[PDB]
Write a protein that binds this ligand. Structure first.
Ligand SMILES: Oc1cccc(O)c1
Ligand SMILES: Oc1cccc(O)c1
Ligand SMILES: Oc1cccc(O)c1
Ligand SMILES: Oc1cccc(O)c1
Ligand SMILES: Oc1cccc(O)c1
Ligand SMILES: Oc1cccc(O)c1
Ligand SMILES: [Cl-]
Ligand SMILES: [Cl-]
Ligand code: NA
Ligand code: NA
Ligand SMILES: [Zn+2]
Ligand SMILES: [Zn+2]
Lengths: 21, 28, 28, 21, 28, 21, 28, 21, 28, 21, 28, 21
């Protein structure tokens, strides 16, 4: 999930966008 | 895990900004 | 619309903390 | 939505809980 | 009042920063 | 108090120190 | 310690949210 | 205190209420 | 003006996110 | 400046990008 | 690199408050 | 930079002031 993906490596804006509706 | 808890707080703010009018679902 | 934008930022942080493990849906 | 409900009059923790998954 | 609620959130953050080890009360 | 003084006009960090312990 | 410093910032925010009108002391 | 209890493991809002006035 | 002061706080967080490794200059 | 541009109307990501180095 | 990312967010907020009218330069 | 200086050991307000315009 988002914590696994983005809390050990920085997520880019595009990666963060993944979690938008 | 506190590190993850603090990370999550920043993630939700980032999603708020990035997602705009689309909104988002947050789940750990 | 800026006031609502600022409020929303605080709302998502509050939901993060209130909802904990369950997470939440932010649908504007 | 939550913005309409909560951005003029303060929503309690109980009220916010309604938006949890 | 949401305006006071949001103001106070930022006030607490500022107090945390400036008050250092001495700390602070938030009361209102 | 702090709301009347600082939510109605900007208080600097210097001014806010007055509200510390 | 920066880790404690960042943790405390989030703690104050949570206390502000949950403590309502009663408020809180932050001391550490 | 609060740092030892809550910076070392997650404290819920319920748990944090114990640190209110 | 407090509204602008609170707005600025959110603006700097948004710039932090948007600008990434570029960084930014903040001036009111 | 940024306050004039972005505190009375919401700035998009592109508008915010204006202020990056 | 996430820890530094989170720290930076707090740094920019602190600079916002410390620097006030002057603003600041965030150059990572 | 500031991240290197300030993300392990706490920077004082005085230290942060060095990064103001
Ligand atoms: O990977 C992350 C974690 C937290 C905030 C963010 O913008 C990115
Ligand atoms: O009604 C609100 C608005 C923003 C934050 C909050 O906790 C409540
Ligand atoms: O006057 C204020 C109000 C809120 C936060 C702050 O740093 C100053
Ligand atoms: O255990 C913690 C630590 C920091 C913020 C929080 O809401 C809970
Ligand atoms: O117009 C604005 C004001 C504050 C934050 C933001 O993302 C946009
Ligand atoms: O060294 C630091 C890091 C983050 C915020 C702050 O006020 C100081
Ligand atoms: Cl953090
Ligand atoms: Cl605000
Ligand atoms: Na998606
Ligand atoms: Na630019
Ligand atoms: Zn943080
Ligand atoms: Zn705010």
């Amino acid at each position: 999930g988002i914590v696994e993906q983005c809390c050990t490596s920085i997520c880019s804006l595009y990666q963060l966008e993944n979690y938008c509706n | 895990f506190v590190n993850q808890h603090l990370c999550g707080s920043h993630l939700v703010e980032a999603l708020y900004l990035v997602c705009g009018e689309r909104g988002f679902f947050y789940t750990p």
